[PDB]
Symmetry: D2
Amino acid sequence: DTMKVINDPIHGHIELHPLLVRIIDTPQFQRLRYIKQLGGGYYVFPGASHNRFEHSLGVGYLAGCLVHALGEKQPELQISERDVLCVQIAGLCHDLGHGPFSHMFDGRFIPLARPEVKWTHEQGSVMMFEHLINSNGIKPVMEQYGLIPEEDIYFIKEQIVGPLELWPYKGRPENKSFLYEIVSNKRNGIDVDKWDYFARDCHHLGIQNNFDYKRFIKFARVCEVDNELRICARDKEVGNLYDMFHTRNSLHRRAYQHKVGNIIDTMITDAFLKADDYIEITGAGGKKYRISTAIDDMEAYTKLTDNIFLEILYSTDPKLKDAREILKQIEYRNLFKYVGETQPTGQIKIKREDYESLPKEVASAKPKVLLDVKLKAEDFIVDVINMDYGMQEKNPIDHVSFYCKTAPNRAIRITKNQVSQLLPEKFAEQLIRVYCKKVDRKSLYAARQYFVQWCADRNFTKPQDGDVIAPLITPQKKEWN
Amino acid sequence: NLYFQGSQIHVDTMKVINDPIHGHIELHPLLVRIIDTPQFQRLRYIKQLGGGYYVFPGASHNRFEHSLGVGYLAGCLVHALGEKQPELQISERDVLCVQIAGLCHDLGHGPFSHMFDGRFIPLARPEVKWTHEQGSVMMFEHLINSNGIKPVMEQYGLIPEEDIYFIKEQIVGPLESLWPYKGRPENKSFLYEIVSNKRNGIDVDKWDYFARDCHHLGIQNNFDYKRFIKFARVCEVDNELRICARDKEVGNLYDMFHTRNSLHRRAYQHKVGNIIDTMITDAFLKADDYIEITGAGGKKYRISTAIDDMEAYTKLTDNIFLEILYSTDPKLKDAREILKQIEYRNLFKYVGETQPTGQIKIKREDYESLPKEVASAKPKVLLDVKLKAEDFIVDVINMDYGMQEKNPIDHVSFYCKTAPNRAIRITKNQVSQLLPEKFAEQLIRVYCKKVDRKSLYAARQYFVQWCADRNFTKPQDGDVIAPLITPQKKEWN
Amino acid sequence: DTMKVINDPIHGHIELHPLLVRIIDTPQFQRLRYIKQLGGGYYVFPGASHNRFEHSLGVGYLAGCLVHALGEKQPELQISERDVLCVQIAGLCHDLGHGPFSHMFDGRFIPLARPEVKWTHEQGSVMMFEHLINSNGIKPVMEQYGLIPEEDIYFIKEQIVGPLELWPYKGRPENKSFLYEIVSNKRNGIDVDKWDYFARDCHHLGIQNNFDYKRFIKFARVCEVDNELRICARDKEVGNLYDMFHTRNSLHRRAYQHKVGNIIDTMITDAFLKADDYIEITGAGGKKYRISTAIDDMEAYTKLTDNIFLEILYSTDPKLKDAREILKQIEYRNLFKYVGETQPTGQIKIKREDYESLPKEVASAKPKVLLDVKLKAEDFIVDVINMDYGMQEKNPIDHVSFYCKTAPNRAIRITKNQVSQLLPEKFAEQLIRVYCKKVDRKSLYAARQYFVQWCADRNFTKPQDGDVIAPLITPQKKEWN
Amino acid sequence: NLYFQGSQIHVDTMKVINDPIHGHIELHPLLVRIIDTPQFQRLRYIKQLGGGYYVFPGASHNRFEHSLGVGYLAGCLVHALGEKQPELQISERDVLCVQIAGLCHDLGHGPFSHMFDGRFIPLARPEVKWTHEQGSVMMFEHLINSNGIKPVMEQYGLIPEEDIYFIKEQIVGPLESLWPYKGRPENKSFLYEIVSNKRNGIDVDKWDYFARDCHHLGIQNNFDYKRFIKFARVCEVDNELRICARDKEVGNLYDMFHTRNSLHRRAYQHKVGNIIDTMITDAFLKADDYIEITGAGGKKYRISTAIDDMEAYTKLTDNIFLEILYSTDPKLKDAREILKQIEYRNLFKYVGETQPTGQIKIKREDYESLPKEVASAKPKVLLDVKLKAEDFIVDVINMDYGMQEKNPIDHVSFYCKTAPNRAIRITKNQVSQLLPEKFAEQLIRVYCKKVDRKSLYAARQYFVQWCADRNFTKPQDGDVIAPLITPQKKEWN
Ligand SMILES: Nc1nc2c(ncn2[C@H]2C[C@H](O)[C@@H](COP(=O)(O)OP(=O)(O)OP(=O)(O)O)O2)c(=O)[nH]1
Ligand SMILES: Nc1ncnc2c1ncn2[C@H]1C[C@H](O)[C@@H](COP(=O)(O)OP(=O)(O)OP(=O)(O)O)O1
Ligand SMILES: Nc1ncnc2c1ncn2[C@H]1C[C@H](O)[C@@H](COP(=O)(O)OP(=O)(O)OP(=O)(O)O)O1
Ligand SMILES: [Mg+2]
Ligand SMILES: [Mg+2]
Ligand SMILES: [Mg+2]
Ligand SMILES: [Mg+2]
Ligand SMILES: [Zn+2]
Ligand SMILES: [Zn+2]
Ligand SMILES: [Zn+2]
Ligand SMILES: [Zn+2]
């Protein structure tokens, strides 16, 4: 068996070692052809037809690119072909755990269907990777190509999900710490996963990418920090790294958190909840699973992809009628109506245990207006969006090591004020979107009054269309004028 | 709300869609009403390039976004012609009609696009005459009737009986068997040259797919449609007003068809993409008796019969692949097994490619007889295995410039700088001596369904022997794959 | 005479009305083929070979694009073909006044050579446009195509430089105020000049553009503000407009203010100063002009382009030897050495009348270090760079009018806090770069100590390489650790 | 500073350059030393496409950035081959030598590139044999000697006497008149196939200019060089180790030469770009006696003689155009007048294009006689004016696949999947019946130096009459420009 070359529109011709080919050509990996990267986003951005499969090839490719580059520049690091393969495998497999419509599944559906489970796609990736290895006899193939399955499988899993349990990793020692900063960088978020998705999502969405990952690679080195050898960037690249996070935030603003993309994800999630009792997916030993329980059995989960949307849409089962009706409303573009967007003022954070109480609050607001209809808590959706630099309140650049021209082997730190005074004052905020499920002219006008009144009551920011939509409400607030 | 000339104005709010190919596309509300139906949205679930995605991972794109693009460009070209030549009397009505035809021209595609009408339906139901274009007409009629579009059409100045007919003609051509069109008369003949140009193949369908397939495949587009639009005019030709291109664009038009042929060679006819389409087709044939799709009046249809009922066909998309793959029914085991072999990349093995020599053409009626011929070859090679007709697949590919043996540029009208309203013709020899001497050829690919090392070695011998026997061209790897056969054919050396 | 089509790599096929063609095909316009858009930038970014000529075609094109779009959407505005042509002409001609190496000439050279003159390229554009009109008989051609030369020439000039002297414009009334917001927008800086240069500079530099001007055009309308009809953007486009200015700032950071690009511009300026007495350029009536005085005579200025660099480089005149030597040092890449970069702390601004005193201050600093050499004020260059959002301290988005979906004809305002809390706290800052003209190992080490000591003394920010370059200096400052 | 294996390591700091075509290019310090000289930096002041910039405003790019690109790709390809095949014993020394040849291959270009050696020098000094490639060898020798490069070469493991010779051979070919190279022996023959491939024209020079010219011109590149690199290997062929391409890449290689021909048709041979080059050449001829360029020992040279002294040639760039345009000397008035006419766009008028018929070829020795022939035509048309030989320009353009009448793919070696070390040949008929039947042709363009309406009308008649007389092909606008002539030629209808 020989290597294969794959032509990718983002990266061009990607070479795949035959061990990678064996892993790719399995039902557990090919499954990713059937899960859209951006989920409901495709229903707003028609170019965003791309699936997790090709993203995963790109992450595999870039992981190998970066590790090879570091090795070529610093032979003293003793990066081996074995190391390169392990990093490539982690890149290829980091997203094996995604479910139907990607973020929607672990971000919206599972928390609603089964509030007690701890589920993240990353956890799913580890479990699916284990299932892929065992179901396809990969361990002997790994051995043939110089890998040590016991150590290296563990290493791959650590690269994907982080520590499985002082140096907290077992797959590789401290003098190879930099290898853990490639696929999923828990220290500062600078990883090849982002580099592929910035480039790939932009290609498909029709928005242009301003981050240059190849430049980052050219300027990346390995430096000693504490007892570890870590990735270090050239000092004057700091501005580019701030802009990388800006880019990430803009893509969330323009595309990933698009108000309509999010409402479509919400409606699909609703249909899945209404279908969940009635859809059967066969797992190991012929056991039957639900959409929400397939995550417990990797054989069942293998067969759980975006196909579930069409299974529901095409169904005739009267038990599936409620679910089916919601999907039919998407097709006719009878979506829940966007009422508006607001933000908390001051240093107030909205806590996750409070999200479910918010539609109640909006319905319980008292707009001093001639209201032709009354709306209830169930008529409202309140979507709270956490926008940050990937580390809650923290500045990720405070967790980057740099090197200088005249001492390329010496790590230094660079603070925010050493860079620019035009950078963000803080690194996390919340956006609150409100929609109304009742879509007639009179319910919508009413929904607007409740919403803006609620913003007033909570001392939230004034909606941008506030004076046009709720003119009898905005004057009452003098903080807004 | 607002008034103009003393009358309330019904302002048409346009939706804007951001497309990676065309950028921001504005959609008139009538187009939006057509788009937001189950019959149109269906196209989100049918890959443009079908099995091609399994070879080119960027080619995830579906017929939906291609269709928006074709609608957009159709409008672009008609608008450009009308702004340059007000005397054509192109109306907003005409523009909407051409946009609608562009939007809807591919409504009739089935699962995996080309695979469905090109491979599956001809094998499943050999006596039906089905094309995706026919399917588009039927699906469009169904879309209109199921969603109450006719009043909306009238609201925006269309005359539905005339205009629906015109739209259908744009998609499929004349609706019968003099001027053959009823939707529009001869002084608007050019309107039929926009979405699907039957005269010479220069249409906006090609323009979108060149750009979009290239974007996704990771191959670069070398044709510039915007330039063509800039240089397009309308000229009187044989009692019609037809599209006419600037004379000096002739080289670019030859290159347009060269691009199309390159895209077929590199991507659409990729040997492995084709074998994947072939395997999916085989699975569908195996599943065909056992899949039920509910149509109108609750009637049940098969994959192959859903084309007879648009309510059922509405629900027939690439999803059928996963329905088969995920199935548990023992009746579906054979179909399911084939799709599983695709996932493991246990594909039929490519043996090679050859072509006929002289002016010999392989007849369509003889395709079925070819695997028998390969299996009946007698290679003077000692082999471990014997292969039968059923072990061979023979795929005959017709590569041309869209009009069989004919040069499409012979059917293009041109104008010259100093007389922009006068149509002329330009012959091949007036352009370049480096252009093709003929405009159609056949490629013959051979595969083996037995995939082990011994069987493939044997298939290579049967194949090259057959090529020698039939005086086909020497396979490119002939010296290496069949050293006991190739040196013995005197016309190969 | 017919229109012409030009193929441009940024905009594709641009149609040029025959009146535009007549203006383009003159020595005053074709001159722009010989002036690099980015000046010394080409010596750092080898793709940046592009000239002001093709940029000017693109600005002409986009100006026509925007005016046509507004007219098509709002016929009630009565935008005529005459208006479109006048706006296109202003777009084509807005940069006629640029001199050798663009920004370098009016930004660095003229202020040094002739400190008493008021010179800006925009002023030069008006003067060159007048010279183009008069020298090429354009007024009858304007008349032939429906223009009113007296009114329309004035209008074009106003679009380029602003008011030539309540409604302050004479070329067009208040109900066509939006026409003054196309080529050079003095109100908020949102204009087609930026749109071309973002796209074009990015194409050549090898950095990707993230601003979508075509999207802006799709969402642009004309709304009533006070007594004027002004350009108004859709409310939810506000984030994109903040990002437009971010983009502008990033391009300045990465490319236009590149530390080496700036030092090359500085050296070229020095050579021009040393050549200025000795270069003769023939103007009207055969009068002779200098590099610095050609700006006084448009006939002379017509012949003043990047060619002056090579005239100096290729010269044999012993009077030009000093100038020639500086250019020869550029060729051999013997450039002044970058010592570092710093910023003022607090709300301190460095005033323009203080720039010339700064090399003195650096030389007068007292580093408590074993210094192997002493450097003087003339050994130092101190480049102060003003980075802002185009309106000094002000937020340009406070000067943008918006419209909402449910009232497309009603202008509103949107404040910073209504948008995002991750946006800049302020909109202007200063960067201070220091270089040393003495390029040996010992002078450079010394230069570093003077520089960092000076930063300490002034309470400027700590240089990013501060601890590596000046380790015996950084500890003294506790504000830095 | 730092140590490794008990020895201080002289770390080679690489400069990085951001190029819009190739992205971030790393330059070894030896390459940097060569780049940072007046002889190299000179290339910043010579436009790649010369007069083409006056038709395509994006084509502002210069030979400098193209040269960096060629250096980069040369290194890329040699590195790729060496990593795939360690048995070739490609050393860092070899890699640097190929990079240096790539960097320096165009050092000999003059003002406006092709215009200078293609048009100007042949007219100014008909007996000299000058090519830009010869100029590159001379300029490289001058660069090395004037900047003390030989010690730097030794510092990085080069053997200057061997390696300078090798570099020169890469640029210009054999340095004399068996194995014809001294720089490297037969087991490194493939190294001569990288920068300037004399065997078949597949080299990295083309790869850079395809990508870069397209980027600037606003036409899209359809050739994928990175793919070619992925599929390139080294194979034994006739006692040499040569580059060999994967068999299935043959279609892409035919398309590479098709792309080159398209770029010549669309851009490099644009009728107006060519007439602008012609006018600039005319100005240079008029100025040639009066421009002085100081060379070595203070000797004075002309534009046409600067090629004889590299110190003077160093100072001869596109700047000569502006020196003429800005001049005040009355001796330069005629030259200056021509450049002024370019600025006002008072260009010579294009009359038309034709080609020979049959296998008739126009001989180079007969080009000079052609304007006389056009002026000696006798159109049966009543005209206001009479035109003489001096009023006509006849530009004969040779369009081929780089090897005159020969198919370059006949000189490419291929390998097959199942035997990657074995070289094979692939013939045209093994590929496609739609490929060119011949590989060279001539285009004949005619212009008139008299630009008024009456003179152009007349020129059109003389031209078409001449085409008829010589049995050349019918001009594409013949029906429109010469209705009194065209219908009377029976082989044109
Ligand atoms: N390039 C780009 N495209 C965007 C951006 N935001 C949305 N899009 C895309 C998604 C859609 O395909 C198209 C229209 O989206 P919009 O957000 O403008 O429309 P939407 O219907 O959500 O808003 P509306 O009903 O007008 O309030 O543009 C953006 O910031 N940049
Ligand atoms: N001409 C082409 N240009 C660009 N990409 C191509 C071209 N032909 C094929 N591809 C793509 C499809 C695949 O993603 C990748 C590899 O395809 P290809 O080289 O045809 O492999 P193959 O596996 O079909 O042939 P083989 O097994 O004989 O090497 O390149
Ligand atoms: N095939 C092509 N593809 C893309 N751009 C082209 C092509 N040919 C020419 N161009 C460019 C060069 C110019 O910028 C622009 C116009 O060129 P062209 O159409 O050839 O005008 P022209 O003025 O030479 O011919 P004419 O006067 O006969 O109309 O398009
Ligand atoms: Mg293969
Ligand atoms: Mg909307
Ligand atoms: Mg022309
Ligand atoms: Mg440097
Ligand atoms: Zn990922
Ligand atoms: Zn189509
Ligand atoms: Zn400008
Ligand atoms: Zn070259």
